[PDB]
Design a binder for this molecule. Structure first.
Ligand SMILES: *[C@@H]1O[C@H](CO)[C@@H](O[C@@H]2O[C@H](CO)[C@@H](O)[C@H](O)[C@H]2NC(C)=O)[C@H](O)[C@H]1NC(C)=O
Lengths: 215, 225
């Protein structure tokens, strides 16, 4: 059992610069049989370098591998927009083999203030016994953001899954949606529902709320 | 060299799951060549299930030992995978690859297939209108959304049209999340505030193309004026 840990999880790079990916192994690998893979969301993963030193057919020469033992580094010269995908390091000397957590590289951009909108549940949806309150964040950077639900001054926990979209191809921004799920009886026992959004580019937190019966 | 996967798109928990990896253009006769299965749950990394070498040599993962079986049929040139004790947390997309030697591992990858493990049934999606309750802050533009809920499997495309059947460029697609055995997703669209206080069109239609029904509900604008 060889445990592979990759760090950092997310890194912000710029096109044309150099990116270094680190791969940590829990023990030495015989014959340095470590390979790197490239995977794009939607499509299938593709092999780039096998044995950490030999490239494969149809792979550009700008990808270079180095290191041995328990330390391996992947250096890429001439970063391209299409290269902002997730990369995994894997060793095939274990039998059975193991895979790492993987690292994601994002395009570095300036901080943009997010937009917060909240939609109260519809009357038709209330008839089904389920109430859904949404909290939408759009055009923010970096991806790291805290979304907390506060209703009747009581902080909620254990009831938010959280969905986040991928990086925009033309805007390089991120968006995420937060959905609040509660019982119909509990919904009628609360008046004001608000979600708090905290951002690096905001001096003070911005809170949005609505009054039941007015929407 | 190419690979193709096939199997059921919906399987109930605690049952038998069977997948077939269809490959053509090579034979598993030379040494070093082998076939392996790699799965990846959404939002997680790749997971190694098992690998089979030549001369009927098979390898299994100790974390999943005594739970998977590897069988090969040279006549049909396709490996058969059997999965038992299905669990909702094990839902992932399964891929198979060919190793062209001892050092070149997984040189060619196929396309894969989504195998959803949910106790529920493939019911038609349900749409719910969303009214914008924003006030005292018109901001740049106003936003209206569409909550597609109770759909399985996750395959939905969103398109926004006006009352006169026009075209809108939203491109705001949120991924689905497994909540209570069902997938939930949200979609929004940005519209200028000037158009709201102008044309008599007070609502727009939300359209979803899912292979369980062609319903399309309309979301009324809150109107500011
Ligand atoms: C359908 O109605 C909308 C009104 O909401 C029309 O949009 C207006 O018309 C121009 C020209 O097409 C658009 O570019 C603008 O978005 C709207 N005008 C203004 C001043 O904002 C839309 O054109 C109509 N569809 C068709 C096919 O005519």
């Amino acid at each position: 059992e060889i445990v592979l840990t990759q760090s950092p999880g997310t890194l912000s790079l710029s096109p044309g610069e150099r990116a270094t990916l680190s791969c940590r192994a829990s023990e030495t690998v015989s014959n340095d049989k470590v390979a790197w893979y490239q995977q794009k969301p939607g499509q299938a993963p593709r092999l780039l370098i096998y044995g950490a030193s030999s490239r494969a057919t149809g792979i550009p020469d700008r990808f270079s591998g180095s290191g041995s033992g328990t330390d391996f580094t992947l250096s890429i010269s001439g970063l391209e927009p299409e290269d902002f995908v997730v990369y995994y390091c894997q060793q095939y000397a274990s039998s059975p083999r193991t895979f790492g957590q993987g690292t994601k590289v994002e395009i570095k951009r300036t901080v943009a203030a997010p937009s917060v909108f909240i939609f109260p549940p519809s009357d038709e949806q209330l008839k089904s016994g389920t109430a859904s309150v949404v909290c939408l964040l759009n055009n923010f950077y970096p991806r790291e953001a805290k979304v907390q639900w506060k209703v009747d001054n009581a902080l909620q926990s254990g009831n938010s899954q959280e969905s986040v979209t991928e990086q925009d191809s033309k805007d390089s921004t991120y968006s995420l949606s937060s959905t609040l799920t509660l019982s119909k009886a509990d919904y009628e026992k609360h008046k004001v529902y608000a979600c708090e959004v905290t951002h690096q580019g905001l001096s003070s937190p911005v809170t949005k709320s609505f009054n039941r019966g007015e929407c | 060299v190419t690979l193709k996967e096939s199997g059921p798109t919906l399987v109930k928990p605690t049952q038998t799951l069977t997948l077939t990896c269809t490959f053509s253009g090579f034979s598993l006769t030379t040494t070093g060549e082998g076939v392996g299965w790699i799965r990846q749950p959404p939002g997680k990394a790749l997971e190694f299930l098992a690998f089979i070498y030549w001369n009927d040599a098979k390898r299994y993962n100790p974390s999943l030992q005594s739970r998977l079986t590897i069988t090969k049929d040279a006549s049909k040139k396709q490996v058969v995978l059997t999965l038992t004790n299905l669990d909702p947390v094990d839902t992932a997309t399964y891929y198979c690859a060919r190793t062209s030697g001892w050092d070149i591992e997984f040189e060619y990858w196929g396309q894969g297939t989504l195998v959803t493990v949910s106790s529920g049934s493939a019911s038609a999606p349900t749409l719910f209108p969303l009214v914008s309750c924003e006030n005292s802050s018109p901001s740049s533009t106003v936003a209206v959304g569409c909550l597609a809920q109770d759909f399985l499997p996750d395959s939905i495309t969103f398109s926004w049209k006006y009352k006169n059947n026009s075209d809108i460029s939203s491109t705001r697609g949120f991924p689905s999340v497994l909540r209570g055995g069902k997938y939930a997703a949200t979609s929004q669209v940005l519209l200028p505030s000037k158009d709201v206080m102008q044309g008599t069109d007070e609502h727009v239609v939300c359209k979803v193309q899912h292979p369980n029904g062609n319903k399309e509900k309309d979301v009324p604008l809150p109107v500011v004026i």
